[PDB]
Amino acid sequence: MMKFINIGYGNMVSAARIITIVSPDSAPIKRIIQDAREKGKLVDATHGRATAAVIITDSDHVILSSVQPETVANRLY
Amino acid sequence: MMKFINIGYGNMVSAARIITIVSPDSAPIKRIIQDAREKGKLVDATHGRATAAVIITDSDHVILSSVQPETVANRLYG
Amino acid sequence: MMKFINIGYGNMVSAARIITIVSPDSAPIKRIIQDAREKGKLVDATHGRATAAVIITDSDHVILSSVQPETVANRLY
Amino acid sequence: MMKFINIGYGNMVSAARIITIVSPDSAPIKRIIQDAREKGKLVDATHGRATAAVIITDSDHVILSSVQPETVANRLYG
Amino acid sequence: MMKFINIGYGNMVSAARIITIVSPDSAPIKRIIQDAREKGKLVDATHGRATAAVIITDSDHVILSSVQPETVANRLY
Amino acid sequence: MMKFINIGYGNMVSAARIITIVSPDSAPIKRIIQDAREKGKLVDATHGRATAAVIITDSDHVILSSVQPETVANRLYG
Amino acid sequence: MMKFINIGYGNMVSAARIITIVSPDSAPIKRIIQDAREKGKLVDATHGRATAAVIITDSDHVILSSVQPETVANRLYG
Amino acid sequence: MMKFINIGYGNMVSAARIITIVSPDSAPIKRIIQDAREKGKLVDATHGRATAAVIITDSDHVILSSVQPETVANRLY
Amino acid sequence: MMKFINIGYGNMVSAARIITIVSPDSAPIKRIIQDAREKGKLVDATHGRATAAVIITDSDHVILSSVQPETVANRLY
Amino acid sequence: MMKFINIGYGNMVSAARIITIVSPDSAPIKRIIQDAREKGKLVDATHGRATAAVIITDSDHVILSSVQPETVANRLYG
Amino acid sequence: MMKFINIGYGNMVSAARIITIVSPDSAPIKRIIQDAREKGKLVDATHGRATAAVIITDSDHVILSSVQPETVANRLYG
Amino acid sequence: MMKFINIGYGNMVSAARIITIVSPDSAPIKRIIQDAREKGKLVDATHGRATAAVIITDSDHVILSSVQPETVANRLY
Amino acid sequence: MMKFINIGYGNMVSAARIITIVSPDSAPIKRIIQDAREKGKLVDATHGRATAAVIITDSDHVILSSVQPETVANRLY
Amino acid sequence: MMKFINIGYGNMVSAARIITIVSPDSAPIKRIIQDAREKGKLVDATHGRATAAVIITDSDHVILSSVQPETVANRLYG
Amino acid sequence: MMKFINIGYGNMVSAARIITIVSPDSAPIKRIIQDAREKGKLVDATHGRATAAVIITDSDHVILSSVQPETVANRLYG
Amino acid sequence: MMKFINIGYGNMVSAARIITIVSPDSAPIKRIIQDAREKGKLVDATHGRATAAVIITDSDHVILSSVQPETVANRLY
């Protein structure tokens, strides 16, 4: 079981710091992304690809990934 | 016992970060949802379907799920 | 030993987040309930039944349950 | 070693959240009780009987119990 | 090894919450006691006896005990 | 599984304090670097070479490394 | 490995709460001592003897000890 | 594996409190040192020798050591 | 020119403390009223009549009046 | 136009510090009184008689008076 | 020179509390409106008509008016 | 009209800084006095005489005077 | 002497709320503009024209004007 | 009526910044002096002589003077 | 007596907002300039020329001017 | 009566912003100077001469002057 999860293109997130991993396709999460962009809490790890998952961490950073949310979780192993 | 729980339509929550999982069936939890919406702490994981469970996390985010609360809790085990 | 406790009618609370579980029948806890209602920290999980237990969590949420307080604690197992 | 301790009349406290359990027998702890009453941090679990122990928790709540302090501590074990 | 330590006359302190246990016989700790008295963080558990130890907890409460400081620590066992 | 990870040129980071390790390849992470520079939270461990990984720690420090992000993560194991 | 360390003359410190143990031999640590004195965070456990070690705890208290820093650390083990 | 690490000349740091150990030879870490000096968070444990490592702790103290950074980490054992 | 303005049924407001006087008939001001009710900043001076004006003061209190907003302002004289 | 207004039984308030003077006749102002009582911001100048006016000051103190609100305001002039 | 300015449909603003009066014609002021809406600082005095002026007050409230900005300012004088 | 008011025995208060001057004979003002004593905001200018007036200032200091409250106000002239 | 100053195209600023009016042509003021944009404190009143003056107000809003800075000040009259 | 008042030995205070001028003759004002000393808000203008007046300013600084309180106040006028 | 002062090259400052106008000729004011630069409170009105005066305003902004401090002050009068 | 006071060598202070002007020759004011130095609130306007007056302003800046304190005040005129 991994401490660090590959969220695509070599970018890594600590599993123990994740609160939730969700789809980017509704208004509340879009509000969270724009808030993070304004506050300097946004990290874009999609490396030019479509955003498929939004990772919210306990430091209240918001990380964009090109990977399916369930796949990010699956990569714990 | 799992680290991440599928709360419907591929959306995942860390089990250790959950405080409570309740029905959306009364005024106080509805106040909590609207507060979270205003503050940018709301996450809607229902994928357009009826809200069946409201998840409050220790980061004081509020997550809407389309599955019953007991279903979220039962999925702690594989 | 459970991580999540059924506090009645399918509603769940994380055991590790509970500070105290008390009866609702005196002035100080009633002050705590009304404070939580005003602050948006109250959760009513009694599902139309009489409040039998008041659960205070470490996030300072206040959760109303229809179950006896000792029974909520017993459900840890 | 128990997670929840019965402090009398069915009222329960999480053992890991307790900082100290003391007698109500002097001015400083009485100051702490009145401060908690004013701030909405006081919990009275005495069920109308004499206060015998004062429990201070890490959330800086103050809980009144009708059982002796050593009795609260001893109940940590079944 | 105990979770709760008897600090005299039945009064109990959680061992994991203690930062330091010191003698009350110098100016800096006396400043700490008076600050706690003013702030409502002082607890007097000496039950009418001479203060022999001052316990500082992580919640920044200050607890007076009639017991030798090394004896309080010894009571962990 | 190691406590400290060498991120290049002798510089060390505590593994348990890392939140994320990402490429410096877009505007949001560059915003994070400049914010840290202004606030005195930036640490440059590149030893004059090209930045290949950006480490964000739970203390909300930002650490620049000359090694690829996957290399930082792989070094968790000896 | 002990929970409490005797730092001289019966005074005790929780090992898990210590951040650093250093000599009082330079201006920065002396600044830290004077700041703690002003703020009411200083604890003098030297019992009237020369300060040999300065203990900084996670509660940002500052504790003066009459024993060498290596002696405080060595006493972690019985 | 040690709880306390000797960072030179008898000075000790708790390993679990360290965030990062870096060289002092660039502008950002020098900003961190000067900030700590102004704020009263700086600790100089070099005991008159050249600074070889800068230790940042979770309490946001900054500790100067005369030892190589990798050597400080090696001393965990 | 008055220091105190009669806002109906003998209730008085200091003119110099008023920021704005508006109609209660749209969503944003209704949000302001409900926020004030929750926070303990609401004052209801309508004395059982329909709310015709909402007074926002510099202390961020919200005062309900039964009088037309322009009439409240006119009463400055 | 006076600086100090007699609000009954010798008690005085600075006119320039008053925000509003209202009847105690509804739930919101009663919430304000109880909040002030809990916080130590309440001043009772009624001298044991029925409360007829509630004065809120810019320091967010709450003062109870036994005279009608219009009487407080009229006394601004001698 | 008036204390209160009619900003349309009977709605009034204290002139001394106004910081700026601008057109709603660009992204930054629209950001300010949406921020105020989320925070409960927005006041809509347009009475259902097109927004022509945005008033920012020193209490950091944001007030929407249906009259041109120059009209608000000109009404300072009777 | 004075800037400074003699509140007895040579002690002076700036008139423009006073919020209210009240009798000390009820529970709420006694709470205010004890709060100020604990917080280091209390000033006792009675010079050994009975407290007749309690002065609350905008800095939230609380000043005890031996003079009738209406007399303190009268001394503005 | 005006209370409100026309800063171009009908946009108005209260003169008493202005701290400084400066040219936009150097790095520090550009930092101030970008900070305000991120924080939601920026107001763009240039109405599609080149920015000629940057107005900093006491509420720490930043207002862009198409008018020369000295001309904005001149319009006080 | 003067802007600056000489409080002895050339030391000056702005009259408009003074809240109260009192004797140092009781425990509460002594608490205020010691608090100011600890916080770095104390100013000693006595030039080595007995403290006769204690000046509290709106910046919550505390200034010690060697002249009687009535003398400070009387010097408001030339 | 003017409301706005020209501090060189068309840049204007409100006279009532100025706390102090000093030479850039020592370490403490240079510390103030660098702090303002880091925090986004610095304004450079020198138009590329040597700094001759440093203006600190009540909003704790720091403004660099190319004119001597006495020149800024003298321009208060027309 | 001046708005700005010359405090020596062309350096200017706004009279309305001054709280107190005192001699630098005792421990409490020296604590205030060192605090200001650490916090970045110190301004040294002595231009290489002996400090004769310490000016404390309402923004809690501390300004060193080479002029007698009573002379600074006299320069109001």
Author numbering:
A (entry chain A), C (entry chain A), E (entry chain A), H (entry chain A), I (entry chain A), L (entry chain A), ...: 2 to 78
B (entry chain B), D (entry chain B), F (entry chain B), G (entry chain B), J (entry chain B), K (entry chain B), ...: 2 to 79
Quote from the publication.
These results, together with further biochemical and in vivo characterization of B. subtilis RemA, suggests that the protein can wrap DNA around its ring-like structure through a LytTR-related domain.
These findings show that DNA-binding by RemA involves the arginines 50 and 51. To investigate whether the variation of these residues impacts the structure of (RemA), we aimed at crystallizing the (Gt)RemA-R50A and -R51A variants. Unfortunately, both variants did not crystallize, likely due to the lack of the arginines 50 and 51, which are relevant to establish crystal contacts involving the sulfate ions. Superimposition of wildtype (RemA)8 and (RemA-R51A/R53A)8 shows that both structures are identical (r.m.s.d. of 0.3 Å over 600 Cα-atoms) and the positions of R51 and R53 overlap with the varied alanines in the RemA-R51A/R53A structure.
